[PDB]
Design a protein around this ligand. Structure first.
Ligand SMILES: NC[C@@H]1CC[C@@H](N)[C@@H](O[C@H]2[C@H](O)[C@@H](O[C@H]3O[C@H](CO)[C@@H](O)[C@H](N)[C@H]3O)[C@H](N)C[C@@H]2N)O1
Ligand SMILES: NC[C@@H]1CC[C@@H](N)[C@@H](O[C@H]2[C@H](O)[C@@H](O[C@H]3O[C@H](CO)[C@@H](O)[C@H](N)[C@H]3O)[C@H](N)C[C@@H]2N)O1
Ligand SMILES: [Mg+2]
Ligand SMILES: [Mg+2]
Ligand SMILES: [Mg+2]
Ligand SMILES: [Mg+2]
Ligand SMILES: [Mg+2]
Ligand SMILES: [Mg+2]
Ligand SMILES: [Mg+2]
Ligand SMILES: [Mg+2]
Ligand SMILES: [Mg+2]
Ligand SMILES: [Mg+2]
Ligand SMILES: [Mg+2]
Ligand SMILES: [Mg+2]
Ligand SMILES: [Mg+2]
Ligand SMILES: [Mg+2]
Ligand SMILES: [Mg+2]
Ligand SMILES: [Mg+2]
Ligand SMILES: [Mg+2]
Ligand SMILES: [Mg+2]
Ligand SMILES: [Mg+2]
Ligand SMILES: [Mg+2]
Ligand SMILES: [Mg+2]
Ligand SMILES: [Mg+2]
Ligand SMILES: [Mg+2]
Ligand SMILES: [Mg+2]
Ligand SMILES: [Mg+2]
Ligand SMILES: [Mg+2]
Ligand SMILES: [Mg+2]
Ligand SMILES: [Mg+2]
Ligand SMILES: [Mg+2]
Ligand SMILES: [Mg+2]
Ligand SMILES: [Mg+2]
Ligand SMILES: [Mg+2]
Ligand SMILES: [Mg+2]
Ligand SMILES: [Mg+2]
Ligand SMILES: [Mg+2]
Ligand SMILES: [Mg+2]
Ligand SMILES: [Mg+2]
Ligand SMILES: [Mg+2]
Ligand SMILES: [Mg+2]
Ligand SMILES: [Mg+2]
Ligand SMILES: [Mg+2]
Ligand SMILES: [Mg+2]
Ligand SMILES: [Mg+2]
Ligand SMILES: [Mg+2]
Ligand SMILES: [Mg+2]
Ligand SMILES: [Mg+2]
Ligand SMILES: [Mg+2]
Ligand SMILES: [Mg+2]
Ligand SMILES: [Mg+2]
Ligand SMILES: [Mg+2]
Ligand SMILES: [Mg+2]
Ligand SMILES: [Mg+2]
Ligand SMILES: [Mg+2]
Ligand SMILES: [Mg+2]
Ligand SMILES: [Mg+2]
Ligand SMILES: [Mg+2]
Ligand SMILES: [Mg+2]
Ligand SMILES: [Mg+2]
Ligand SMILES: [Mg+2]
Ligand SMILES: [Mg+2]
Ligand SMILES: [Mg+2]
Ligand SMILES: [Mg+2]
Ligand SMILES: [Mg+2]
Ligand SMILES: [Mg+2]
Ligand SMILES: [Mg+2]
Ligand SMILES: [Mg+2]
Ligand SMILES: [Mg+2]
Ligand SMILES: [Mg+2]
Ligand SMILES: [Mg+2]
Lengths: 271, 46, 93
RNA sequence: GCUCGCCGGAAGACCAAGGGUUCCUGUCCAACGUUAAUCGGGGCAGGGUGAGUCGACCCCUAAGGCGAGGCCGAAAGGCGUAGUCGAUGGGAAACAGGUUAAUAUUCCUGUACUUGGUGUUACUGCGAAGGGGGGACGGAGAAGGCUAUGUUGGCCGGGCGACGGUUGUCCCGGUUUAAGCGUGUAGGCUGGUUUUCCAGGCAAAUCCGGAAAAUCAAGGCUGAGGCGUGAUGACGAGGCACUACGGUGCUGAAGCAACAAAUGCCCUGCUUCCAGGAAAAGCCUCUAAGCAUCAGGUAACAUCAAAUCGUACCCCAAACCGACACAGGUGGUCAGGUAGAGAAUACCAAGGCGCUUGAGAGAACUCGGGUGAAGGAACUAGGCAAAAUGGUGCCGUAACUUCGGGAGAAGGCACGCUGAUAUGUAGGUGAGGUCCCUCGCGGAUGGAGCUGAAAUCAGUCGAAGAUACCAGCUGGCUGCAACUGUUUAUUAAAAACACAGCACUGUGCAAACACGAAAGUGGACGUAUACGGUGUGACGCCUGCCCGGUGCCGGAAGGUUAAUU
RNA sequence: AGGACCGAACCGACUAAUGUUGAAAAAUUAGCGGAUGACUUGUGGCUGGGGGUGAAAGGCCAAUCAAACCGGGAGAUAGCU
């Protein structure tokens, strides 16, 4: 549920938050936790390779099952949990053999719900099947790109993929971007959409909230000097240039995709 | 006011010590140059 | 067993001072200059064999050498090792 | 030596870092010390640093470093696997009293504790590089229970006052005691037990996880403090006695209670929130191979051992960083009394100092302050500076507003002391006694004693009672920027930058993009509700026309056009 | 609850005076801003010179910055003094 905050202070006036009373209030499941330290956008040369990364809250990593490989064995959703590593919520599920895992929580999943993966699984949200067994016209998420690799597409909060056609060994998928892509029919998918669809309705409200998430300030190129950015310079506010990146590449409309290896799988670009 | 030299023995040895100089071929050339000049003190080590 | 060559090397000199005299005449402790590499066990064994006295315990400290000036030239004296050797209350060394 | 003054959340005390003998004693005064110097952090000589328990070393890991092979690169090298290092973090154990000129949780006295090697005894399934548990973790808030500690009373010893009074409801001094061991309380968490079964835990497991029954209703864990013992001891005012007058010998009374009370402890707790909060070992446990009347394990006892290095001294500073005995800089610990909300401020305690040229004089002028007739911004670029305001409670408070604000708007009233209510109230705390009790660190009752605001009435002094220190000037119109933030270290703090929000655009994951001759790495252990770039810059009402030019995107017929042939 | 309010520690640096062969190669005094946060701070680590880092001032990178420092080419060149 989205709640607007009362304007008790200027940093609070514009805040809109997403409060979900159904998320676990305790600690995460420890055997499925790992460490992950922050990079600051720095690679192994120590150099910044992505700008505007740094700080923010310390976060533990939750091992999430994207493969969904325990087929034939039903699992019950123990609970829903907050995951700081992603926009979607996760679900702690317990298998009939005593194994516990984390999965992406699809829309409508609640504690006590039952899920299953495999060719034999029923066609209902949360179940994972090969798309060759999934009917054409279905809404799926956590979609594999290579058989056995694990879900890579439609993982963000509220996202989903539409199975549009099936021809031979390949399904055609409509992705959130609007792209039409070919994937092998033996690739697995999970039925339903990713939950937490109201994630995009939150308003941060203040600069500090973005700082909490590890985002550092963006300085406009025009605000710099010519030595620093192609947009820099000028007595007062001047632009008079075609907009480019800090490295000199046109940044309003110029296409940058060049992958002839995967061109053949695209039926239609997003436009 | 805070001046530039803030002494720390551990940092001094890790930056300029004998083993730091020997870890790289350029540091070994520093040691060779100082030996050829006849320095009484090769490094900050002692 | 520490060998007798080592034991004869370990002890260097008796230490003479007001504190040493007070230690001997109050707590039955002899103060000795010993080898820089001498351990407490070695000092105990050496004192026990060469002075024929039963030893209670050995305390040791390393004495850092002084920087001195000789003829307006700067030198340093050697570090040495001091041992407080407490005898067993009836020994009279 | 006596007096005076200054600091006292420090200008006291203890450290880390850094320094390295500056520490103590004797001796000297050339130079050094902004003067003299008999003095010194100066010269010279001698002395001084004592550890199973403090710290390091050591075991364990973070970031990160290095890195057998290896992958990559003209060479040099780059990256990285297995590993191995790397604390600022995790991992056993000692306290009190005494002592030196100078060390002390290290020496001595008393009383402890930990880990390991053996050996004797008793019992006995042990076994890891593997499994599980544990270690192991955020912010904010709230309160109870405590303690350190303080105050008063009681007690013991002493006093009867240089000037009116002072045998009393008077004055002064002391009124301390640890670790350990036993007990197990306030609080906090958790349902326990037995039986059978199993697609999970890289194999096994009796461990963990899962399932199903029966059974019992209290079982376990954790945990401040208190109490007892430690302690017939130690310490202890003073008293008696030496001095080579700097310090030391003997002896020793009381040593209690009530109240107040933390920012310390219970508490790595509890409540709540979102931004969702290390790792590994030690430790517990489970088995595998295997050992298998051996080894090994558990328990008890005796014995041995616990090495090595540091330990002086300064440490907000004359010893460190600043060329100086330099108004500078420097992380952690402790936190007395009166007033006070307070770690502010004033004055004091313990403790420490008067800042290494003095002595006069009492011109101009400079600096830092006090006061000022009448006027009151006339000054000036400008109210710059100064002056002024200033507390608590209560009454009261406009436009406008995004309904939160504006607001402490503005403005006004009360304020000391004494007595009464009430010889100390409301509240808080709570002894004996009394009864009961799943019997103790229990419950109920009862209020003694202690502490103790605030109000009203009556009075009373002064020019003045928030009397000192301390401690908002206020209102109106208008530009800019929404706002908190950031910035030209050292002439610019702003209207500049950022910002939440908006838009365009790229990007289908071996993503775009960035650092890399490369291998790789970041993006991201993310996946279009995501990520990068660009512009704009909360919010409200909005954002019109132009694609001719430059760019970008799409097209592919035609013309032209490279290597090649 | 809060990038909430007043206000010490702590962090900063808006005004004035002093000082300008300084007590000080950037401070002192009186006022001033933030003071639970986009806060501050200890220890250690990483990024290297056409490179880094930059809530962007050409700021900062050891009192040095529109291209650090050190050594070398090197006695660069200097129609200039
Ligand atoms: N400068 C003078 C010092 C300063 C420190 C201050 N605390 C007091 O100390 C004394 C202290 O008051 C004296 O307690 C007496 O008086 C108290 C009430 O006033 C009573 O509770 C107490 N029962 C009574 O015995 C004590 N005997 C000696 C202390 N030195 O006077
Ligand atoms: N709605 C009316 C609001 C009510 C609240 C009140 N505080 C004021 O707020 C305004 C505030 O006064 C304004 O500052 C002016 O006045 C100050 C003092 O004279 C000057 O220092 C300042 N240079 C000058 O600009 C400010 N520009 C904008 C604020 N909205 O007017
Ligand atoms: Mg960005
Ligand atoms: Mg931005
Ligand atoms: Mg932007
Ligand atoms: Mg930009
Ligand atoms: Mg830019
Ligand atoms: Mg600029
Ligand atoms: Mg350019
Ligand atoms: Mg212009
Ligand atoms: Mg222009
Ligand atoms: Mg001893
Ligand atoms: Mg020692
Ligand atoms: Mg005196
Ligand atoms: Mg000396
Ligand atoms: Mg001295
Ligand atoms: Mg002199
Ligand atoms: Mg003379
Ligand atoms: Mg001297
Ligand atoms: Mg090799
Ligand atoms: Mg390497
Ligand atoms: Mg490593
Ligand atoms: Mg290691
Ligand atoms: Mg450490
Ligand atoms: Mg001392
Ligand atoms: Mg108490
Ligand atoms: Mg000491
Ligand atoms: Mg001086
Ligand atoms: Mg000084
Ligand atoms: Mg400080
Ligand atoms: Mg003060
Ligand atoms: Mg005068
Ligand atoms: Mg004058
Ligand atoms: Mg004058
Ligand atoms: Mg004057
Ligand atoms: Mg005046
Ligand atoms: Mg006047
Ligand atoms: Mg007048
Ligand atoms: Mg007037
Ligand atoms: Mg005028
Ligand atoms: Mg006027
Ligand atoms: Mg005029
Ligand atoms: Mg003024
Ligand atoms: Mg004033
Ligand atoms: Mg105007
Ligand atoms: Mg602004
Ligand atoms: Mg605005
Ligand atoms: Mg505007
Ligand atoms: Mg501001
Ligand atoms: Mg400046
Ligand atoms: Mg300024
Ligand atoms: Mg975008
Ligand atoms: Mg990918
Ligand atoms: Mg990838
Ligand atoms: Mg890549
Ligand atoms: Mg983006
Ligand atoms: Mg960008
Ligand atoms: Mg703007
Ligand atoms: Mg703008
Ligand atoms: Mg923006
Ligand atoms: Mg053509
Ligand atoms: Mg605030
Ligand atoms: Mg600054
Ligand atoms: Mg100031
Ligand atoms: Mg403010
Ligand atoms: Mg404030
Ligand atoms: Mg400029
Ligand atoms: Mg500089
Ligand atoms: Mg250049
Ligand atoms: Mg040449
Ligand atoms: Mg020349």
């Amino acid at each position: 549920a989205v709640v607007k905050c009362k304007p008790t202070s200027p940093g609070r006036r514009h805040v809109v938050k997403v409060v979900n009373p159904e998320l676990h209030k305790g600690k995460p499941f420890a055997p499925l936790l790992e460490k992950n330290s922050k990079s600051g956008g720095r690679n192994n040369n120590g150099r910044i390779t992505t700008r505007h990364i740094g700080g923010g809250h310390k976060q533990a990593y939750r091992i999430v099952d994207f493969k969904r490989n325990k087929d034939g064995i039903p699992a019950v959703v123990e609970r829903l949990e907050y995951d700081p590593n992603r926009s979607a919520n996760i679900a702690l599920v317990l298998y009939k053999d005593g194994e516990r895992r984390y999965i992406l929580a699809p829309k409508g999943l609640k504690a006590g719900d039952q899920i299953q993966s495999g060719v034999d699984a029923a066609i209902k949200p949360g179940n994972t099947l090969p798309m060759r067994n999934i009917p054409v016209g279905s809404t799926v998420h956590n979609v594999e790109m290579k058989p056995g690799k694990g879900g890579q597409l439609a993982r963000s909060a509220g996202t989903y993929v539409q199975i549009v056609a099936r021809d031979g060994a390949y399904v055609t998928l409509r992705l959130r971007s609007g792209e039409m892509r070919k994937v092998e029919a033996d690739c697995r998918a999970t039925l339903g959409e990713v939950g937490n669809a109201e994630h995009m309705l939150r308003v941060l409200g203040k600069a500090g909230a973005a700082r909490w998430r590890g985002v550092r300030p963006t300085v406009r190129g025009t605000a710099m000097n010519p030595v620093d950015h192609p947009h820099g310079g000028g007595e007062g506010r001047n632009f008079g240039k075609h907009p480019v990146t800090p490295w000199g590449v046109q940044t309003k409309g110029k296409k940058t995709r060049s992958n002839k290896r995967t061109d053949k799988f695209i039926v239609r670009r997003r436009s | 006011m805070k001046r530039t030299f803030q002494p720390s023995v551990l940092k001094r040895n890790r930056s300029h010590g004998f083993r730091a100089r020997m870890a790289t071929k350029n540091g070994r050339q520093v040691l060779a140059r100082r030996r050829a000049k006849g320095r009484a003190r090769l490094t900050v080590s002692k | 067993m520490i060998r007798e060559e080592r034991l004869l090397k370990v002890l260097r000199a008796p230490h003479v001072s007001e504190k040493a005299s007070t230690a001997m005449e109050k707590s039955n402790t002899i103060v000795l200059k010993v080898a820089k590499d001498a351990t407490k066990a070695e000092i105990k064994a050496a004192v026990q064999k060469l002075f024929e006295v039963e030893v209670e315990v050995v305390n040791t400290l390393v004495v850092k050498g002084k920087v001195k000036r000789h003829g307006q030239r700067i030198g340093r004296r050697s570090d040495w090792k001091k041992a407080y050797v407490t005898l067993k209350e009836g020994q009279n060394l």
